Amino acid sequence: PTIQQLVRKGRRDKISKVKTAALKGSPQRRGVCTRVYTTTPKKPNSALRKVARVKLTSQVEVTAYIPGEGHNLQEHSMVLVRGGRVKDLPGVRYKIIRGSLDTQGVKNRKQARSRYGAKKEK
Amino acid sequence: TMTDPIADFLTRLRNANSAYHDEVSLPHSKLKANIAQILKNEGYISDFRTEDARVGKSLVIQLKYGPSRERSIAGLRRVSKPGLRVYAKSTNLPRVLGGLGVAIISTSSGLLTDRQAARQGVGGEVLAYVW
RNA sequence: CGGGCCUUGUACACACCGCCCGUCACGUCAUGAAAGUCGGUAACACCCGAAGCCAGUGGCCUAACCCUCGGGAGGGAGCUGUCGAAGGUGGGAUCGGCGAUUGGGACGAAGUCGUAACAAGGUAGCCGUACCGGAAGGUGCGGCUGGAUC
RNA sequence: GUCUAAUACCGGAUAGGACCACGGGAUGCAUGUCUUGUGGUGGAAAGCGCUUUAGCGGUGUGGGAUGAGCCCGCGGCCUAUCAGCUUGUUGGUGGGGUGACGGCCUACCAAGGCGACGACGGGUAGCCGGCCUGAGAGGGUGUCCGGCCACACUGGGACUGAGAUACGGCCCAGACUCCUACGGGAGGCAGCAGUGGGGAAUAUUGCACAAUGGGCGCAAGCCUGAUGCAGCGACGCCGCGUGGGGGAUGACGGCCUUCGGGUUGUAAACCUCUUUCACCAUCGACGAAGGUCCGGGUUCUCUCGGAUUGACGGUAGGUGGAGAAGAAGCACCGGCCAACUACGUGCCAGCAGCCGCGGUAAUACGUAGGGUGCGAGCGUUGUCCGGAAUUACUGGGCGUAAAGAGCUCGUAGGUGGUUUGUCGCGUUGUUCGUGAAAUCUCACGGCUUAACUGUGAGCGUGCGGGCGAUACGGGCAGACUAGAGUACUGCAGGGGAGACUGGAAUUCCUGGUGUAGCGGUGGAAUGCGCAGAUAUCAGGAGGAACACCGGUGGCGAAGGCGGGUCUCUGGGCAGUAACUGACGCUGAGGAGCGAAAGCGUGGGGAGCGAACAGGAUUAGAUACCCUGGUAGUCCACGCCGUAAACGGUGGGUACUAGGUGUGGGUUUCCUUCCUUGGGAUCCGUGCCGUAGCUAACGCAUUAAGUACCCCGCCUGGGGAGUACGGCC
RNA sequence: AGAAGGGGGACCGGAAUAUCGUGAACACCCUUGCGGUGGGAGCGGGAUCCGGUCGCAGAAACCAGUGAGGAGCGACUGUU
Ligand SMILES: [Mg+2]
Ligand SMILES: [Mg+2]
Ligand SMILES: [Mg+2]
Ligand SMILES: [Mg+2]
Ligand SMILES: [Mg+2]
Ligand SMILES: [Mg+2]
Ligand SMILES: [Mg+2]
Ligand SMILES: [Mg+2]
Ligand SMILES: [Mg+2]
Ligand SMILES: [Mg+2]
Ligand SMILES: [Mg+2]
Ligand SMILES: [Mg+2]
Ligand SMILES: [Mg+2]
Ligand SMILES: [Mg+2]
Ligand SMILES: [Mg+2]
Ligand SMILES: [Mg+2]
Ligand SMILES: [Mg+2]
Ligand SMILES: [Mg+2]
Ligand SMILES: [Mg+2]
Ligand SMILES: [Mg+2]
Ligand SMILES: [Mg+2]
Ligand SMILES: [Mg+2]
Ligand SMILES: [Mg+2]
Ligand SMILES: [Mg+2]
Ligand SMILES: [Mg+2]
Ligand SMILES: [Mg+2]
Ligand SMILES: [Mg+2]
Ligand SMILES: [Mg+2]
Ligand SMILES: [Mg+2]
Ligand SMILES: [Mg+2]
Ligand SMILES: [Mg+2]
Ligand SMILES: [Mg+2]
Ligand SMILES: [Mg+2]
Ligand SMILES: [Mg+2]
Ligand SMILES: [Mg+2]
Ligand SMILES: [Mg+2]
Ligand SMILES: [Mg+2]
Ligand SMILES: [Mg+2]
Ligand SMILES: [Mg+2]
Ligand SMILES: [Mg+2]
Ligand SMILES: [Mg+2]
Ligand SMILES: [Mg+2]
Ligand SMILES: [Mg+2]
Ligand SMILES: [Mg+2]
Ligand SMILES: [Mg+2]
Ligand SMILES: [Mg+2]
Ligand SMILES: [Mg+2]
Ligand SMILES: [Mg+2]
Ligand SMILES: [Mg+2]
Ligand SMILES: [Mg+2]
Ligand SMILES: [Mg+2]
Ligand SMILES: [Mg+2]
Ligand SMILES: [Mg+2]
Ligand SMILES: [Mg+2]
Ligand SMILES: [Mg+2]
Ligand SMILES: [Mg+2]
Ligand SMILES: [Mg+2]
Ligand SMILES: [Mg+2]
Ligand SMILES: [Mg+2]
Ligand SMILES: [Mg+2]
Ligand SMILES: [Mg+2]
Ligand SMILES: [Mg+2]
Ligand SMILES: [Mg+2]
Ligand SMILES: [Mg+2]
Ligand SMILES: [Mg+2]
Ligand SMILES: [Mg+2]
Ligand SMILES: [Mg+2]
Ligand SMILES: [Mg+2]
Ligand SMILES: [Mg+2]
Ligand SMILES: [Mg+2]
Ligand SMILES: [Mg+2]
Ligand SMILES: [Mg+2]
Ligand SMILES: [Mg+2]
Ligand SMILES: [Mg+2]
Ligand SMILES: [Mg+2]
Ligand SMILES: [Mg+2]
Ligand SMILES: [Mg+2]
Ligand SMILES: [Mg+2]
Ligand SMILES: [Mg+2]
Ligand SMILES: [Mg+2]
Ligand SMILES: [Mg+2]
Ligand SMILES: [Mg+2]
Ligand SMILES: [Mg+2]
Ligand SMILES: [Mg+2]
Ligand SMILES: [Mg+2]
């Protein structure tokens, strides 16, 4: 509008909010995984969800989802955490990768068998 | 106030062509006369000429229409603006409607359109596209 | 009380048994304030100042030259001042953290009190402002129609 | 403490490219540049070997080549919630210092320089050819390679030398590890490795100097973690395999089933054929018209032609032997999106990017089967671009969706009517130079093709010089009246300010009459009165607002403005064409004006009336209704600076059917037929409507149409016009 | 607010004959005066800069503010 207006003050793009935090440019980052527990989703989709309060190696604290069924995580398991946000829960924005240091792959997994962590067979 | 009588002239052209006016009158300037000359010899209008106005010169141009009531100009657009001047070299001249329209080019060789500018070898100011 | 036709208003469409506002209570999270407190950063002023360059002094040392053979000439060691990093002192600036206590916000649940708005929403509604009130809100003054009436 | 040299050191003689002074001769771009002359001063060196034409040196200088130093135009992040920064700072003189100009430093003198085109400051960051993405413009990024810069444990400084951030040099301070006999010393992997530590995460303490580049020596030769390679990581790209031709009774098994069958499926069994890759065996490299020795070479050179020299490496590669033989997994299948049935589970497990699925029949969870897409890869994450025309230059918008500042004036800036001549800065044409190499594109060439490489042609958009041009923009010197302003004559108006002043009405007071009610409501009550109320008459006090005119109207930038008179005063409109001659438009900031409420001081206070109180209503009633009633409303002077300050529509200008009102002028025809009719034109102000525009509503000559100039503003909703800071 | 917190301070010499600023004489010029123009002697004052010298110490003895931060009350000077 009135190109002189553009030269006095140029077009400046809207601030792109950082989609993922607590990891600081890290595709994955590990955490000591305190306070594993189970929480409820929103008004629809009434269920129980396995989440963990992770002290990440950015010296931060976040909430992560435990994908799949079953976990051996109690209070101090060295977990690897990546992105991915669940729709149902408000404060969940991260996911522990199954099949890492102290997160075993989900048992009895024969379909897709790379997510959730799983060797083929013996 | 009255800025860019070039755009004033071509907007008078647009408004009267859209209103199916046989003829338009406006102030005369040498640039307007040469623009009307280009419009003539490119075939977008019929004759133009000049009155003895009360002050200055008065430029009247006639608008040609087809056998039925179809516009001989499909539109037009000022391109060089007093708020933004646009210049084009002979090697990168604008192409109006891919060629079916023309662009008035101001050059050291005087006012001359896209074909003359390309095959004469100089570019420069691009006043408007008529098409 | 219910029903039908036309028009009007509507934020209702589960269709007024609709929708919907705000406190209060419960939970979670982000965040503001806060006596104070813990850090960082960059300067500034002054003090002390290494090495080091520079400017002065230089009895102690001395192979290149002269010489009257006595020595001399030329140089060196050593000593002081200016500037100077670091350090010290001080008062500010500035960026952060924590903080008893306190304030609002957002999201949550089938909680409590009302019913403020949407129909003339039951006192038309909104705007600014002022005062008042558990709370939505009420009222005054001016304004608007994003309301009405003749 | 003795003793010994040198191409180490010192002293000399001569030697112009030191100097000074005076001059010539050429050129300019000013301090200035070169070639010379005269005179007076000055400064350099060196030797080392020999088969008897083995050879290495040195010094003074003129010019090249190369490297470098410095300076400058342009370009390249965020931020004003950073507006005042600068004293050796700005300049000069005389000096010093430097290789060199230079406040680079110093004595003196003056008081200048930078900045809203963003100084100073805060935050972030190595920069680039490039790389990623995109149609491009753009956006992200700066990793391999290459160029430039900076640094070398942290901080400060000098030395040698042509050349110094002097990584593996020196001096000092500081922090850290080690030895000491405690006095004292040593060390700096961001070189090649490699170790520990952080992380989600990135490797061998290998070989060769075979080649090239480099260092040194007459040379052979020695050094080179440069370099060539080699090992490990699917880390990425490319290439190739894990068989092929037949092969139905369309076999078993599996799955589904409407129980007749379908599907896996020529896919299998079987026959037949050939061995890319892997296996064994063997030969065996190019990279070396190279590097040295010994025959001959007329000497420099050259080969007839003989020995020997490759880390890669017995590697790549050729050939023989054997037989389908040793070699496939990953993801997904509701829509985007290509790919479906069954069983197990039953808001549970769980899936998911999105919107959604699962609560007894799940194409959406787990398993099976089938299928799809891939394939030594397939998925998840993270990051970036795209889609996103959702920051819009290309390429967006602001009446009601987010968006016109409340209004105006005006600073910087942006922008600018008609015409003449010139400059040629922009613009534009051409050439020259540069725009390294590599990268990207085109064409060939070779590694078995490919990835990769090489060559030739584009790219290198930009910049500098010369020669053209002046149409447009810009500068200059002019001109014109059309925009703008002035003058003159008229005109309309609630435009503003001050003073005085008028009447109605309300309230109160004084009196006259007069008696029992008045008031108020949906109905009441509180309340007023019986001490004389309400009512009615007369007089008086006071305050506020100015009925009828009055309108749909007029005026004002907006907010707003009307009882009358007087005084002062602003703007607007029309006409004449008398004057100026573009003086215009807009306007970041800024300044002024700015309803009502509110605030300060002082007045005033009838009526009304936030608060308050009572009454009523009500479940409650902090309300609506009633009765009172304080601030306030009014005045003067300040402050506030906000409104649905709205046409929810910024200003200016030009153009684009009309129809009909109304307000203010001017002008022509029946002109005296008065008719104060008809027409034209200027400026308003409304309604309706065409084209056009719009999501629609609607706007529509007073645009929300068609265009141009300038400004303000928006980028999903909340959080929030809030916090923090700052200004008032 | 003298916020706080710092620095300098003595003597001698030079700058220094007009350094500078105060006061203004002999002898020259002009409307004749307790007059005016210049002129600068001696006499005092202050400040700076440079160099040197001395001590433990230069404000020299005597003299001569402690400062900062947070509350309560009272505004304040005053009065009892
Ligand atoms: Mg009927
Ligand atoms: Mg709460
Ligand atoms: Mg805080
Ligand atoms: Mg010293
Ligand atoms: Mg707290
Ligand atoms: Mg209500
Ligand atoms: Mg209400
Ligand atoms: Mg009600
Ligand atoms: Mg209501
Ligand atoms: Mg209100
Ligand atoms: Mg009230
Ligand atoms: Mg009102
Ligand atoms: Mg000897
Ligand atoms: Mg000699
Ligand atoms: Mg000599
Ligand atoms: Mg030699
Ligand atoms: Mg100086
Ligand atoms: Mg000088
Ligand atoms: Mg000099
Ligand atoms: Mg950095
Ligand atoms: Mg695109
Ligand atoms: Mg680089
Ligand atoms: Mg790197
Ligand atoms: Mg280190
Ligand atoms: Mg040197
Ligand atoms: Mg080293
Ligand atoms: Mg290394
Ligand atoms: Mg680790
Ligand atoms: Mg070598
Ligand atoms: Mg390698
Ligand atoms: Mg590989
Ligand atoms: Mg891997
Ligand atoms: Mg491939
Ligand atoms: Mg073979
Ligand atoms: Mg599909
Ligand atoms: Mg089922
Ligand atoms: Mg599934
Ligand atoms: Mg993703
Ligand atoms: Mg875009
Ligand atoms: Mg995206
Ligand atoms: Mg848009
Ligand atoms: Mg607009
Ligand atoms: Mg809006
Ligand atoms: Mg407006
Ligand atoms: Mg104006
Ligand atoms: Mg203006
Ligand atoms: Mg201006
Ligand atoms: Mg201009
Ligand atoms: Mg012009
Ligand atoms: Mg080929
Ligand atoms: Mg090829
Ligand atoms: Mg190539
Ligand atoms: Mg190139
Ligand atoms: Mg005019
Ligand atoms: Mg008036
Ligand atoms: Mg009266
Ligand atoms: Mg009264
Ligand atoms: Mg009476
Ligand atoms: Mg009475
Ligand atoms: Mg004139
Ligand atoms: Mg402004
Ligand atoms: Mg004002
Ligand atoms: Mg008021
Ligand atoms: Mg007041
Ligand atoms: Mg008050
Ligand atoms: Mg008062
Ligand atoms: Mg009341
Ligand atoms: Mg009450
Ligand atoms: Mg007044
Ligand atoms: Mg506002
Ligand atoms: Mg208004
Ligand atoms: Mg607005
Ligand atoms: Mg407009
Ligand atoms: Mg009109
Ligand atoms: Mg209309
Ligand atoms: Mg529109
Ligand atoms: Mg938002
Ligand atoms: Mg605020
Ligand atoms: Mg504040
Ligand atoms: Mg003090
Ligand atoms: Mg003295
Ligand atoms: Mg001294
Ligand atoms: Mg002493
Ligand atoms: Mg007291
Ligand atoms: Mg006192």
Structural class computed from helices and strand pairing of chain B: alpha+beta
**Quaternary structure classification:** part of a larger assembly
Question: How does the overall form of chain A come out from the CA principal axes?
Answer: elongated
Helix content of chain A: under 10%
Record field, number of beta strands of chain B: 8
Ligand identities? magnesium ion
Distance between the termini of chain B: 28 Å
* Main β sheet profile of chain B: 5 strands, antiparallel
The helix-strand sequence of chain B is: HEHEEEEEEHE
The Cα radius of gyration of chain B reads: 15 Å
Strand runs of chain A, count? 6
What percentage of amino acids of chain B are in beta strands?
Answer: 15-25%
Task: Tally the helices of chain B.
Answer: 3
**Rg estimate of chain A, integer Å:** 20 Å
Which strand order does the major sheet of chain A show? Answer: 1-5-6-4-3-2
Which structural class fits the helix and strand makeup of chain A?
Answer: mainly beta
Q: Give helix % range of chain B.
A: 25-40%
Termini Cα gap of chain A: 69 Å
What letter string, H or E per element, gives the SSE order of chain A? HEEEEEE
> What is the number of helices of chain A?
1
Largest sheet of chain A: 6 strands, mixed
Short description:
By secondary structure, chain A is mainly β. Chain A has one helix at 4-8; strands spanning 29-31, 34-39, 49-56, 60-65, 79-82, 94-96. By secondary structure, chain B is α+β, with helices and mostly antiparallel strands.
